[PDB]
Amino acid sequence: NFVFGT
Amino acid sequence: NFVFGT
Amino acid sequence: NFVFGT
Amino acid sequence: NFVFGT
Amino acid sequence: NFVFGT
Amino acid sequence: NFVFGT
Amino acid sequence: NFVFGT
Amino acid sequence: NFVFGT
Amino acid sequence: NFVFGT
Amino acid sequence: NFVFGT
Amino acid sequence: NFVFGT
Amino acid sequence: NFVFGT
Amino acid sequence: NFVFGT
Amino acid sequence: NFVFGT
Amino acid sequence: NFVFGT
Amino acid sequence: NFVFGT
């Protein structure tokens, strides 16, 4: 899994 | 803002 | 793990 | 789970 | 304001 | 765990 | 200003 | 836990 | 004023 | 422990 | 400004 | 002025 | 865990 | 102000 | 451990 | 001015 919020 | 994760 | 920033 | 509110 | 968590 | 800020 | 961490 | 009020 | 703690 | 200040 | 890491 | 520590 | 508030 | 910790 | 500053 | 370390 990965999460990448900007 | 940011959110980063695994 | 996660990092969260304003 | 994660929560990210700004 | 902010809320961050897991 | 959580962090909450005004 | 207030920050609370669990 | 931590508390940070200013 | 301030309040700091754990 | 806590510290409180006016 | 706030950054929290799990 | 007052500071109190537990 | 880490906390970084400025 | 600041709060730093682990 | 934590450090807190005004 | 105040700094507190745990």
Q: Which DSSP string do the residues of P1-6 spell out, in sequence order? A: --EEE-
Residue K1 buriedness (CB in 10 A; 0-12 / 13-18 / 19+): exposed
Structural contact between residues B3 and D1, judged by C-beta atoms closer than 8 angstroms: no
Nearest CA to C6 out of M6, P4, I1 is that of M6
Structural contact between residues M5 and N2, judged by C-beta atoms closer than 8 angstroms: yes
Structure tokens at C2: 């996660």
Which residue type is seen at H4? Answer: F
Give the count of alpha carbons within 13 A of B1, CB side only.
11
Q: Which residues 1-6 of G are in CB contact (within 8 Å) with H?
A: 1-6
- Give the number of G-H residue pairs with CB atoms closer than 8 Å: 18
